[PDB]
A paper describes a structure:
Aldo-keto reductases (AKRs) are a superfamily of oxidoreductases capable of reducing carbonyl to primary and secondary alcohols, found in all phyla. In this work, we identify the enzyme [name], which is responsible for tylosin reduction. Phylogenetic analysis indicates that [name] is the founding member of subfamily D within family 12 in the AKR superfamily. Specifically, by combining steady-state and transient kinetics, X-ray crystallography and molecular dynamics simulation, we demonstrate that [name] exhibits a positive synergy mediated by an unusual Monod-Wyman-Changeux (MWC) paradigm of allosteric regulation at low concentrations of the cofactor NADPH, but an inhibitory effect at high concentrations is observed.
We obtained [name] ternary complex with NADP+ and tylosin at 1.93 Å by cocrystallizing [name] in the presence of cofactor and substrate at a molar ratio of 1:1.2:10 ([name]: NADP+: tylosin). The structure of this complex is similar to the [name]-NADPH binary complex. In the ternary complex, we found an incredible phenomenon that one [name] monomer binds two molecules of tylosin - one at the substrate binding site where the reaction happens and the other at a remote site which is 15 Å away from the active site. The first tylosin (orthosteric tylosin, abbreviated as tylosino) at the active site is refined with an occupancy of 79% and the position is different compared with that of the second NADPH in the [name]-NADPH binary complex, thus excluding the possibility of NADP+ binding. Tylosino is close to NADP+ with its C20 aldehyde carbon, the one to be reduced, 3.8 Å from the para-carbon of the cofactor’s nicotinamide ring. The distance between the aldehyde oxygen and the phenolic hydroxyl of Tyr53 is 3.0 Å. Outside the active site, the second tylosin binds above the two extra helices α7 and α10 which lay outside the TIM barrel. It has slightly higher occupancy of 93% with well-defined electron density except for the glycosyl β-d-mycinose. In addition, out of the eight subunits in one octamer, six subunits bind tylosin while the other two is blocked by adjacent asymmetric units due to crystal packing. The distance between the C20 aldehyde on the tylosin and the para-carbon of the nicotinamide ring of NADP+ is 25 Å thus its reduction is impossible. The remote tylosina binding site revealed that there were relatively few polar interactions, with hydrogen bonding between Glu193 and Arg195 and the C4 hydroxyl of α-l-mycarose, as well as Glu253 and Arg257 and the C20 aldehyde on tylosina.
Residue numbers in the entry:
A (entry chain H), B (entry chain D), C (entry chain C): 1 to 331
D (entry chain A): 1 to 232, 234 to 331
Write the structure that this text describes.
Amino acid sequence: MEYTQLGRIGLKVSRLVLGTMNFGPTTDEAESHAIMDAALDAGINFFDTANVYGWGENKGRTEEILGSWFAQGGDRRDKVVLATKVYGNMGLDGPAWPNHDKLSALNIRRSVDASLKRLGTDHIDLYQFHHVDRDTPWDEIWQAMDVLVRQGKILYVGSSNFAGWNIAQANETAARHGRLGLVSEQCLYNLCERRAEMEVVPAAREYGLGVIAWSPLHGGLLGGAIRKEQEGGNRRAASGRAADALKDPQQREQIQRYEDLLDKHGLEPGEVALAWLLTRPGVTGPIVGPRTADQLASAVRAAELTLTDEVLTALDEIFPGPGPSPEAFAW
Amino acid sequence: MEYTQLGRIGLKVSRLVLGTMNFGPTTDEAESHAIMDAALDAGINFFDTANVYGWGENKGRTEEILGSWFAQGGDRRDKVVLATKVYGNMGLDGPAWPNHDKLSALNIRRSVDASLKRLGTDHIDLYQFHHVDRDTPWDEIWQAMDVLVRQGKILYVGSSNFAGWNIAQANETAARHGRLGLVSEQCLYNLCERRAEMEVVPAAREYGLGVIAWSPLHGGLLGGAIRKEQEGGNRRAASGRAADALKDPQQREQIQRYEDLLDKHGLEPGEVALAWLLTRPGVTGPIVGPRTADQLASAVRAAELTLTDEVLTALDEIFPGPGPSPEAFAW
Amino acid sequence: MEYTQLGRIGLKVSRLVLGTMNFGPTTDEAESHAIMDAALDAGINFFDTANVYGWGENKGRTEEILGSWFAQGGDRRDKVVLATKVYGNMGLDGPAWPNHDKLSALNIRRSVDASLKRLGTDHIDLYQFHHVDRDTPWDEIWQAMDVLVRQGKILYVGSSNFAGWNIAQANETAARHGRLGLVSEQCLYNLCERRAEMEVVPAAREYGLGVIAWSPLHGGLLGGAIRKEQEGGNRRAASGRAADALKDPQQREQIQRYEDLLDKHGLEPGEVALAWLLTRPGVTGPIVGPRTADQLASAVRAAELTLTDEVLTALDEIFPGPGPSPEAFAW
Amino acid sequence: MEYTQLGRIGLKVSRLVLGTMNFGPTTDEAESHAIMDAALDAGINFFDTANVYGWGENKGRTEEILGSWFAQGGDRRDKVVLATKVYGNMGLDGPAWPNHDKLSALNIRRSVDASLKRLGTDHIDLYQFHHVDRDTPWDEIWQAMDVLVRQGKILYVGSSNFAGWNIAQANETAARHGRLGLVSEQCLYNLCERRAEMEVVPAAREYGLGVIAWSPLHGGLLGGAIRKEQEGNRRAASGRAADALKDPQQREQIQRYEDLLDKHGLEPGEVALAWLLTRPGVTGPIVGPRTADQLASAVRAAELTLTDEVLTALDEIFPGPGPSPEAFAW
Ligand SMILES: CC[C@H]1OC(=O)C[C@@H](O)[C@H](C)[C@@H](O[C@@H]2O[C@H](C)[C@@H](O[C@H]3C[C@@](C)(O)[C@@H](O)[C@H](C)O3)[C@H](N(C)C)[C@H]2O)[C@@H](CC=O)C[C@@H](C)C(=O)/C=C/C(C)=C/[C@@H]1CO[C@@H]1O[C@H](C)[C@@H](O)[C@@H](OC)[C@H]1OC
Ligand SMILES: CC[C@H]1OC(=O)C[C@@H](O)[C@H](C)[C@@H](O[C@@H]2O[C@H](C)[C@@H](O[C@H]3C[C@@](C)(O)[C@@H](O)[C@H](C)O3)[C@H](N(C)C)[C@H]2O)[C@@H](CC=O)C[C@@H](C)C(=O)/C=C/C(C)=C/[C@@H]1CO[C@@H]1O[C@H](C)[C@@H](O)[C@@H](OC)[C@H]1OC
Ligand SMILES: NC(=O)c1ccc[n+]([C@@H]2O[C@H](COP(=O)([O-])OP(=O)(O)OC[C@H]3O[C@@H](n4cnc5c(N)ncnc54)[C@H](OP(=O)(O)O)[C@@H]3O)[C@@H](O)[C@H]2O)c1
Ligand SMILES: NC(=O)c1ccc[n+]([C@@H]2O[C@H](COP(=O)([O-])OP(=O)(O)OC[C@H]3O[C@@H](n4cnc5c(N)ncnc54)[C@H](OP(=O)(O)O)[C@@H]3O)[C@@H](O)[C@H]2O)c1
Ligand SMILES: NC(=O)c1ccc[n+]([C@@H]2O[C@H](COP(=O)([O-])OP(=O)(O)OC[C@H]3O[C@@H](n4cnc5c(N)ncnc54)[C@H](OP(=O)(O)O)[C@@H]3O)[C@@H](O)[C@H]2O)c1
Ligand SMILES: NC(=O)c1ccc[n+]([C@@H]2O[C@H](COP(=O)([O-])OP(=O)(O)OC[C@H]3O[C@@H](n4cnc5c(N)ncnc54)[C@H](OP(=O)(O)O)[C@@H]3O)[C@@H](O)[C@H]2O)c1
């Protein structure tokens, strides 16, 4: 396993981050536990979850599945950098009761206690904002997080789905009073969606944040979705983001070009999408989303792949990116 | 229910704040619980109380009534933004034993623990200074509040009965050392008393405080007190501020003009006075003071009223305001 | 002559400030020079002017009259604490060209250079904002003033026609970065208009500003305006604020009672109004507005008057004040 | 003329900003001076220029044309908020000598003195970075600007072609030590190019910067370029506009735009300027008249009220992304 620092901070992480969103709605508890055992065996020490994972009436289930895994002992909790999230509504889906979503100090306080209880742990290593909340100012947010840091309930704070200028405002505000700022941004970034290149990733690099890419396969779309389009099972690529893209002729053609390119080179589409993210400047690593232990083993192989310049150039032809602003749209 | 941010902060509140001062001395425990259940039913998530409410030998009773309400369960504590106050003497009415009133770190320590015990909760969401204390410096006050913040016993700090320059000094002092300042000012503001427009509300707006208006009907004076002047009940308008106003020929003539105006437009005096405050720039909302469940329902109707330009202009004729200083008295 | 520190700073000033607004439009250049010589002979070391004084097409004339006075030599400039103002339109009366009024760094730059030229001096001792400018932020204002301080073009900065919270915001902003804040506020304050007591003077005193009362006789109204109502000459009391007040029945009765009281006590109304301001806590002194040398001589006598407690009580009853906020309108 | 505060600061500016890039290479000195007199007559008090304007061997000519304008007197300098730029190479076109371009304190020092001399003035009201310079840190940049502020050579500092996170970093750095930060961002923004909506404008709004839009007609492309395509010089015949008209999809977009405004009897240049005036946070467009009639046309656009029907139609023809992260994530 290849390791790196998470941005500027002292925390060392596997360049594969284990996502857990599938654990519950798509992968059951026993296979979820097997995937986490295999992840630990492979040297993956960095797990990403969220309070809302589990979905609908089962929001919180994923954290509970991690909690029963940790409860088995065997140094699992000691070994893992445990990340979860606050922002989402944990009540009945639909409009949230006021301050039962978003980033008020009020919702931060109740959300962290519920996550700690489901996870069966006394601390979260990386507590992440799930989304920017434009209505909560950073002196309120940093007050709430600093309460948790000094109580020992969290160690690090990260962001997810921020704009670049939110990262800068957040960390400048933290730095004025000596607080450790955001240590990582968790952003949508993959071959299909590269617009985090314009400002989010440049800002994260300037401020020394880790960058961990969520939906690195675009929801399974990049994992061989066309070749697999007729298979059964509870495949993630059969619904949601990937299925929507495959109904668009232009997006489907792109994915078809991708799968045909890789057939000519003896490469696997999911493994290449992961390996591609590992070449991007500033990217700590993809947050892999295995549905099966087999798909985790494939991810470990992806982290060992060396993409040739020829393949990288061809991928840029199919999936061009904008580069940084202002050059992306001005000069 | 209409919602808004409390000034600049991330807390979302109903634009009706439920005042509880009547609960105890005027409304009994059973009916207070009914009013609070109905407030939650109508979407009101923001309750104001004080340690002194109850009055006399029953100071603390209002908080205890809220404590018994919370103790039923039913997500009541989780759903409510709970505001209470410190400054008042909680001992025998009359001159307080030194440091058993006002805002020393000593009285803050003892008042908050006594409030938490009566409320049956481990934290207060909005802890308010009941009045400015000119003898306690802001580095002493912010030390005391920051102790409670970091212990998790409070979340936010607010002011009540401040001058505008007190708000500015408090929040500039807080900002110097990373602290969230005052998030709201609770001030006397209604059709009868508009002098908060001079400097209190302008300073609150500059510093991004919510503004929540206490005695929004001037103690019942604006709720139809002339028409109801001969009625029984233990009506708040039969005593105190309202009764005193009706003794004065000029103030009584003003209320008469008001009630006669509203008869011509088919409007209710109590609802119009609440709806008028909701139109004022910077006002988060009125802190309604229902004596009955029907009066809470009437307040909810008031929050849906749309006052016409013609009625707003007429109210300004009856109840002119000074505008901001310096223009209010100089140029 | 009685001297005092100007609030908290090391500058010592006479408790009569010589106002120059009459110099030009009401008092001609030679009599203006005689009044300034008489003021210096009496120990008055503190002169207030403004760029706009002169009025109309003659804006700047008063500063020029002071300039020709200083140009006479004889240690006049070295002896005088020279105060002038920025904010007013110096162009054609009417709507100003953008940034040719108010407190942008652009207007501050052009205004001070024009004042310095008219006054015939290389520095202004006290450069005052004529009025709050709600559209210019304090980091812009203090940048512009600090440029002038470091160049040696001004020494001290003062306010005029501020609200109390503006004083607080201004001086907290200056103190953040080691700058000397406002040293004095120049507000309307006299027997007739006491609402600076609510917040402006309390804020000034908290922050250690001098308080220099402008229009101390309410534009001549308190100088015997009723007794002299039939007189000729270009008396200031025949126009503007004083004339408007004498056409008001209640203000006229107030002034009549005042003049009758002072007839009974054998006291001069102009002198008493000045002596009254000298008793008010926090007041550095009145800015006298003599039209003649004899009126200056009269002001000097006023500074040596001791009003009996009987007269002081009678004045407070004829001319009541509001006291400080929040007590002035709440409790 | 409608006026507004420049973002959060005390400076008041007309919502039309007079751009001067045409003065010299496209509009001659006499006509440039007439456009500036007409701008002042209509109440425009805010002029944008740059040291490089004039182009090639004539870089600096535009500042000189403004300088001879000011030299005529009549309160012209006192009335105008004068904005210019530092970053561009002022030597021979091609790779610049080291530190004769970009934002080092060394190049800032030499560039401002040369602009002051050409402009014939002792101060610049708004001195703008022409482009983000990723190699110069903000404590160096603010040192250099503060030197100029304390000497009276500039009043305000603004940015141009920044990313949103650059605006935040600059102004947080400035605020740490009591300095007034950036007061304005000058970005490309018009119907054709709306990606400043992702982060640049949202960051400017949060930090209280003015937002002034350069090439508001996309270089004349939005001024009726297809109707005038065979006319006889015209900025639309070259550069950004010409390239867009060579592309089938952009040409079709502009053809749809010009058809839409034919139906409503409106002028394309005026509508494109009026459209920017409706965008939240936009101080106004930096108009680029080549002629005095084009300036009077801009003044008419500032009085125009676009109906909601037309605004909806423009938005469908010229969709924008809105803010990040929602623009690409959720
Ligand atoms: C010393 C005891 C005296 O008490 C006073 O003289 C107090 C009066 O001057 C009050 C305060 C005035 O009431 C004020 O009328 C001003 C014009 C307002 O000022 C305005 C304009 C402004 C610019 O000032 C602004 O700042 C302010 C906010 O609003 C002000 N406002 C707050 C509303 C308002 O209180 C008057 C109206 C004016 O004359 C109010 C009405 C009801 C009135 O006739 C009362 C008469 C009384 C009780 C007189 C006795 C008689 O006792 C007398 O005692 C004297 C010492 C002797 O001369 C006695 O001789 C026997 C005897 O005279 C008859
Ligand atoms: C008002 C309703 C109209 O809807 C539109 O006009 C939307 C179109 O303008 C879209 C957005 C364009 O698609 C855009 O093509 C630009 C050149 C790209 O811009 C480029 C360059 C850039 C510089 O802009 C850069 O910033 C950007 C990121 O990428 C842009 N990109 C975001 C990809 C891309 O969305 C066009 C391609 C060019 O025209 C996409 C293709 C599929 C198309 O023909 C669609 C036609 C439709 C549906 C037309 C109706 C006709 O309805 C018509 O309604 C009008 C109101 C009337 O004129 C009617 O005529 C009478 C009627 O015509 C029948
Ligand atoms: N911060 C946020 O907003 C956010 C949002 C989404 C996700 N996340 C995080 O990012 C993690 C990953 O997101 P995601 O589940 O959408 O990831 P993804 O990798 O884009 O989608 C997962 C799907 O890709 C396929 N796949 C996974 N590994 C593969 C491999 N080695 N080879 C071929 N196909 C493979 C599987 O598709 P099939 O099931 O069709 O076989 C799998 O179900 C989540 O667990 C969560 O922790 C964060
Ligand atoms: N910070 C402070 O110093 C301070 C001071 C006072 C109050 N407060 C807070 O502000 C809250 C409200 O104060 P308040 O009780 O004096 O409010 P208020 O609304 O001015 O007076 C309450 C009275 O108004 C009448 N009323 C209430 N709702 C009505 C409606 N919808 N229609 C017609 N009449 C209506 C009732 O009068 P009748 O009983 O005659 O029917 C009621 O007893 C208090 O509960 C407390 O939370 C704070
Ligand atoms: N910062 C501001 O906004 C502002 C506004 C106004 C003034 N000021 C400053 O404050 C200064 C004073 O203002 P002001 O001229 O309006 O003062 P004022 O004393 O209220 O009015 C002056 C008039 O009072 C009469 N008077 C003056 N001294 C007298 C005395 N000893 N005995 C009897 N009557 C006397 C004269 O009236 P008659 O002519 O009728 O005899 C004189 O013209 C100005 O010179 C200016 O420096 C500042
Ligand atoms: N910060 C930067 O990087 C940057 C870059 C470029 C420009 N700028 C600034 O932005 C200003 C404007 O840029 P620009 O010249 O490219 O603006 P523009 O409006 O996009 O293009 C100017 C052209 O549009 C046409 N036009 C102008 N006004 C018109 C009207 N009222 N009706 C119809 N057509 C009209 C004319 O084209 P025809 O000649 O074909 O008639 C004119 O030459 C410049 O002067 C400069 O100050 C800044």
